[PDB]
Structure 1
Amino acid sequence: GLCDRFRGFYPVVIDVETAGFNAKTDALLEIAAITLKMDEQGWLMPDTTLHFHVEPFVGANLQPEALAFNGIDPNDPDRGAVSEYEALHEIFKVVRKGIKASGCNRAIMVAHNANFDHSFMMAAAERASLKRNPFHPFATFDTAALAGLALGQTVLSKACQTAGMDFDSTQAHSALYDTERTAVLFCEIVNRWKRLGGWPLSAAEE
C-alpha cells in the first residue's frame, strides 16, 4: 500500500508560482497540490488535485523579472486570489485527511528542484501561523534528482519527454499544470522502478 512504499510518508506533489526566488521576501502568487494513491497491484497514480491563486503577503516583494516570467499580474480583477492562510489551510486539511485514510504518519513534498517550493510553502505556512502543518520540515522527494537517476535528465521538460510524456516546452506552465506534469513524472519513475523489479526489495528474487 501507499503507507508501505515510503515508510509511512504520504507523498504530495506541490508547485508554486512566485514573484522572486526569496521565500522570505518574495510573494507567493500561486500553489497547486496533487495527492497520490496506489492501486491494488501497487501502482502509483495521481489522486486528488487542489489549486489556488494567492494574494501577496503584506509588504511582500514583487520582482518584475519574475512577473515577466510567469505572466501573473497580482492585480488582475479576474484572478480571484485567496489569502495564504486560506489556501494552505485547505491544502493541509486535504493532506491530513489523505494521511489518515491511507494510514500514513506524515506528508512529504514531491517537487522539481523541491527546495524552492518547499521553502516558499514553509515560509507562507509560518507567516499565516498555520498549525498542524503535516509536511516534513526539511525532507523532500525532488524529481530533478529522481529523474537524473532514472532518466538521466534534471530539467523538468526534458525529463518528462524522455519518460514519454507530453510536454510543450514552448508553452508557459502555471502551477496547476506544472504540478500535474511533475506528478505524472514521479509516478512514472516509481512505477518503472517497480516494473523492472526494483520494488518490492524481494521482487528481484521472487
Structure 2
Amino acid sequence: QLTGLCDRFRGFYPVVIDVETAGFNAKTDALLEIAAITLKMDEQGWLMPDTTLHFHVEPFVGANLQPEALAFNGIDPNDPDRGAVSGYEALHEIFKVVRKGIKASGCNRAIMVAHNANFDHSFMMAAAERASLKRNPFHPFATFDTAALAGLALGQTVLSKACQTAGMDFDSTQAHSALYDTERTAVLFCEIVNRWKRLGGWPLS
C-alpha cells in the first residue's frame, strides 16, 4: 500500500554525501570539496538517485593542508582555475535543496548516507560551524553508514570491494574524486535497499 519514501525510513530523507579533505581532523583540516546526492522513490517502491550537487571549496583561513592528504586525492588548493568556493557557499546550497527535497517527500528530517559516515558527517558539521550556518536539516548524530550496511548485505566493509561484490563496476583510480565516490556510494545504497525489497524483506509483513 505504502509507495512513498517517507514511509521507508520513518520520515527520514536520506541524502548521500562524500567529502575530500586536507587531512583527518574535522576541526583543523581543510574541506577541499564536497558532493551531495539526494534520493527519490517511485510508485513501485524502488530507490534511485535524484538530484546531484558538487563543489570545490577553498580551505578556511588558518586551516591545515596535510601534504599526504593532497598526495592521496591529488588536489591542488593553489590552482587558480579550480573555481572553488567558500565552505558556507557549498553547504548553504546543499542544504536548501535538501530542505526543498524534504518537503516534497513529506519527510521530517534529512539523514546523511556515507561510507564510514561519521567522518563525512564530522567534517560537514564542523564546516557548518565555521560557516555559522543554521537550521541544518541533517540529523546531529544519526547516520546511515554504507560500510556497515555493506557488511550485512554483501559481507564487505571496503567501498571498493563492496561495490565489486554487489556486481557494480568500480574504478579505483577515479575513486579519489568526490563526485565519483558520491555516485558509486549512492547507487550502492540503492542496490542494497532494493535487493532487500526483492527478497521480500520489505514491507515488513
TM-score (norm 2): 0.97
Instruction: Report the CA distance between 1:77 and its aligned residue.
Output: 1.3
Instruction: Report the CA distance between 1:32 and its aligned residue.
Output: 0.2
Match of 2:39, SS?
strand
Instruction: Report the CA distance between 1:169 and its aligned residue.
Output: 2.2
Please list the CA deviations of residues 142-194 of structure 1 after superposition, one character each: whole Å capped at 9, or x if unmatched: 00000000000000011001111110224443110100000000000000011
Please list the CA deviations of residues 11-65 of structure 1 after superposition, one character each: whole Å capped at 9, or x if unmatched: 0000000000000000000000000000001000000000000010010011001
Instruction: Report the CA distance between 1:127 and its aligned residue.
Output: 0.8
Please list the CA deviations of residues 101-138 of structure 1 after superposition, one character each: whole Å capped at 9, or x if unmatched: 11000100000000100000000011101011000001
Q: Percent identity?
A: 100
TM-score (norm 1): 0.97
Partners of 1:135 and 1:175 in 2: how far apart?
A: 20
Question: Unaligned regions of 5+ residues in structure 1, if any?
Answer: none
- Would you say 1:84 and 2:87 are equivalent positions? yes
Query: What corresponds to 1:28 in structure 2?
Result: 31
Partners of 1:50 and 1:162 in 2: how far apart?
A: 27
Partners of 1:53 and 1:168 in 2: how far apart?
A: 21
The alignment covers a number of residue pairs equal to: 202
Asked whether the 8 Å contact 2:72–2:176 carries over to 1, the reply is: no
Partners of 2:167 and 2:24 in 1: how far apart?
A: 30
Partners of 1:173 and 1:94 in 2: how far apart?
A: 25
Partners of 2:34 and 2:10 in 1: how far apart?
A: 26
Partners of 1:98 and 1:142 in 2: how far apart?
A: 21
Partners of 2:22 and 2:145 in 1: how far apart?
A: 22
Partners of 1:73 and 1:173 in 2: how far apart?
A: 13
Asked whether the 8 Å contact 2:16–2:113 carries over to 1, the reply is: yes
Instruction: Report the CA distance between 1:87 and its aligned residue.
Output: 0.3
Partners of 1:84 and 1:175 in 2: how far apart?
A: 15
Which moved further from structure 2: 64-73 or 172-181? 172-181
Match of 2:93, SS?
helix
Question: Unaligned regions of 5+ residues in structure 2, if any?
Answer: none
RMSD: 0.7
